[PDB]
Amino acid sequence: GSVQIVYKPVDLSKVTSKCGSLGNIHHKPGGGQVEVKSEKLDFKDRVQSKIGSLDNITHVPGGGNKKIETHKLTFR
Amino acid sequence: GSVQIVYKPVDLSKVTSKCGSLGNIHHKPGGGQVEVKSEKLDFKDRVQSKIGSLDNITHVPGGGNKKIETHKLTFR
Amino acid sequence: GSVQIVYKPVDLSKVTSKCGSLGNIHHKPGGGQVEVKSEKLDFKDRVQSKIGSLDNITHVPGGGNKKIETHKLTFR
Amino acid sequence: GSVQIVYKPVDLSKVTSKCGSLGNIHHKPGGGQVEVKSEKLDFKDRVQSKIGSLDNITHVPGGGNKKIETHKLTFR
Amino acid sequence: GSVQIVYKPVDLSKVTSKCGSLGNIHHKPGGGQVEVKSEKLDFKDRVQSKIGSLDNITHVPGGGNKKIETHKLTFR
Amino acid sequence: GSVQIVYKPVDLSKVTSKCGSLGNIHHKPGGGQVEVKSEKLDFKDRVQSKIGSLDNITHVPGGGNKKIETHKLTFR
């Protein structure tokens, strides 16, 4: 026997923003506090952690648009 | 026997925003507090964690539109 | 037998922003505090951590748009 | 008023043993095994403990007789 | 008022053993094993402990006789 | 007022052993093994400990007899 695989996907796709102005943005949080206590940490085989992380962010992109795309073909 | 597979999807798509202005934005919270107590942490084989994370975000994109897409073909 | 694979994906795609002006942005947080205590840490085989990290960010790109794309073909 | 207290207990006591011989004494046990696992011990204000104590005693006194005695008087 | 306390206890007491001979004694235990695992020990304010104590004793006194005695008087 | 205390305890007491001979004593144990693991030890305010102690004793006194005696008087 025999096999033909033809794979021809098309995007004419668009992702877009139009905006006049980003105005006035004030970010004024009051002062926080964090405390943590433990005795042992013991991590094995593919581990992530975050411990004790007081964190303030202002993020004002003039458009933050995106496209995420994937293709897979597998044959056996 | 024999096989033909003909994969031809098409996107002519638009994802869009139009906006006048972002005005006046105030992010003005009072101060928080966090406390955590433990004795042992013992993590094995593909783990995530977060412990004690007082966290303030202002996020004001001039449009934050997205398209998320995948294609897969599998043959045996 | 015999096999033919014809892989020809196409993008004429666009990811885009238009914006007039980024205005006035004030990032004016009060002062924080963080404390952490432990006695042993023991990490093995593919580990990340962050411990005790007071953190302030302003991020104002004049457009922060992106495209993420992947292709895979595998044959056995 | 007035008080007289006249405390005069008497012991003419004997505690005694008489014995011929202690013969032949064999203490011949097979070997044991002990295992213990824990993580934390945290002791406060007047504590005793024993952990993991495989223990063989032969105790062959030629008489182990005893007298245990107390006297108390209290006045207010 | 007035108080007289008279305290005149008497012992003509005896504690005794008589024995011919202590014979043949064979303390012959097989060899043992002990194992203990933990992570933290934390002791405060009047503490005793023993951990992991493989122990063998032969005690053969030619008489182990005793008297324990106490007296107390208290006045307020 | 007035107070008189007349404390006159008496012992004509004896503690004794008589024994002919202490015979033949063999203390012939097989070989032991001990293992202990931990990570932190933290002791405060009047503490004793023993950790990991393989121990063999022979004790053969020609009589080990004893007398323990105490007296207390207290006045306020």
Author numbering:
A (entry chain G), B (entry chain B), C (entry chain D), D (entry chain C), E (entry chain A), F (entry chain E): 304 to 379
Give passages from the manuscript.
The C-shaped core of each protofilament, that is, the Alzheimer's tau fold, comprises amino acids V306–F378 (based on the numbering of the longest 441-amino acid tau isoform).
A similar head-to-head interaction between two protofilaments with the Alzheimer's fold has previously been described for an intermediate polymorph in the in vitro assembly of recombinant tau297–391 tau into PHFs. As in PHFs from human brains, the reconstruction of HA-tau297–391-seeded filaments showed additional densities in front of residues K317 and K321, as well as inside the C-shaped protofilament, close to residues H362 and K369 (dark and light blue arrows, respectively).
